[PDB]
Amino acid sequence: AAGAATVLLVIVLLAGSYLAVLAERGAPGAQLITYPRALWWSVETATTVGYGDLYPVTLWGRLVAVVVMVAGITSFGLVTAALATWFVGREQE
Amino acid sequence: AAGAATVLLVIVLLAGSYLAVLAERGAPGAQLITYPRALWWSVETATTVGYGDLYPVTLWGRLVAVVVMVAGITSFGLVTAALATWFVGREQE
């Protein structure tokens, strides 16, 4: 809720970045192989931005990716259902 | 609400375009470096379109980008919750 759905998004967004590097390192070709850009990648995923920077190539990397979508889109379908109430409440008051 | 969540989206969409050029100018390679296409980029971000035209490469540019997603998706999860009521109200009446 308040900052609770928020926090869970960030657990996912770290572990998602961490496991991404672990799964993708070893597949010849992968771009998702340093912990920085792996983190940016999990945001580009939780938020459905689809910019096209990074993406996984290994099977397990795609599994990590799916979890980020589910657990992120859900968090963000609730962080953004929450940022939308208090600021509209603030300016509607 | 009415046009209030709307307006806040547009503050973000300008400052987002403005700061994007400032952060990305100086990094060798960036495409996000003129104020026009920087503005189009913040729409391609607030709306989750992910067309793949522009995107940031600097750290700070990505930070600007995240703010646009949060503050935009939220605005747009409310501009679009608002355009959906009055036109459906209009044609359901």
């Epitope: 672990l22 993708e24 070893g26 992968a30 771009q31 192989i33 340093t34 912990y35 | 390679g29 490469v57």
Partner: antibody, heavy 117, light 106 residues
């Protein structure tokens, strides 16, 4: 000295050998330990990486995979087992500390392996 | 497996002068190149990271240039202590790779 590896080994042809790299300083969860090989008068040949904490290792696709990587999670020392060597396998072997951001900040002194009878 | 190609192989120069080693990649890697110096008998040593950013404790002679498929290590001046081999290394796609190397003669 951060990364710290022995000076020189001597292996009979066909025999195995184990190589060490004890690393003071920090011992981060996310740290990776790489191994690079320098045949005399040659460039740098990446061999493979290992993240010690978690435990996985990935080797160089292209070279004849002779070796295997291991680590000791609460000794801060990592290992590399070269198995059945020729004289093509004689070189200097460095370990490197990649933080997870893509460059080898820290290098060991290098271990000189000479495969002869 | 990305190919880093350092031309030329050797580099002659008179002391105090500027000097630039080219590295050229077999496809775009943005800025994820890094430069290493390796003197005679010594281990390699990071010089420039991410193709432009400098390392703390490196002489201000060294300057990182380039982006895309063309990169450049440069030394704004030269003196006798910089004689060594020089290597690049991409970190943009697995596996990490190295350059052929360039030696610096005076």
């Amino acid at each position: 000295v951060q990364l710290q590896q022995p000076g020189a080994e001597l292996v009979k042809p066909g025999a195995s050998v184990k190589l060490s790299c004890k690393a003071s300083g920090y011992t981060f969860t996310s740290d990776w330990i790489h191994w690079v090989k320098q045949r005399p008068g040659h460039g740098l040949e990446w061999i493979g990486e290992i993240i010690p904490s978690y435990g996985r290792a990935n080797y160089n696709e292209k070279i004849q995979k002779k070796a295997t990587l291991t680590a000791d999670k609460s000794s801060s020392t990592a290992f590399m087992q070269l198995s059945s060597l020729t004289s093509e396998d004689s070189a200097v072997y460095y370990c490197a500390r990649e933080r997870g951001d893509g460059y080898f900040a820290v290098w060991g002194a290098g271990t000189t392996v000479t495969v002869s009878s | 497996d990305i190919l880093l190609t350092q031309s030329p192989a050797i580099l002659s120069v008179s002391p105090g002068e500027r000097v630039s080693f080219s590295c050229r990649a077999s496809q775009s890697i943005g800025t994820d190149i890094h430069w290493y110096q390796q003197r005679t008998n010594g281990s390699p040593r990071l010089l420039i990271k991410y193709a432009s950013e400098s390392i703390s404790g490196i002489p201000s002679r060294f300057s990182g240039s380039g982006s895309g498929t063309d990169f450049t290590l440069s030394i704004n001046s030269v003196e006798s202590e910089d004689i060594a081999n020089y290597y690049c290394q991409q970190s943009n796609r697995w596996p990490f790779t190295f350059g052929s190397g360039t030696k610096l003669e005076i």
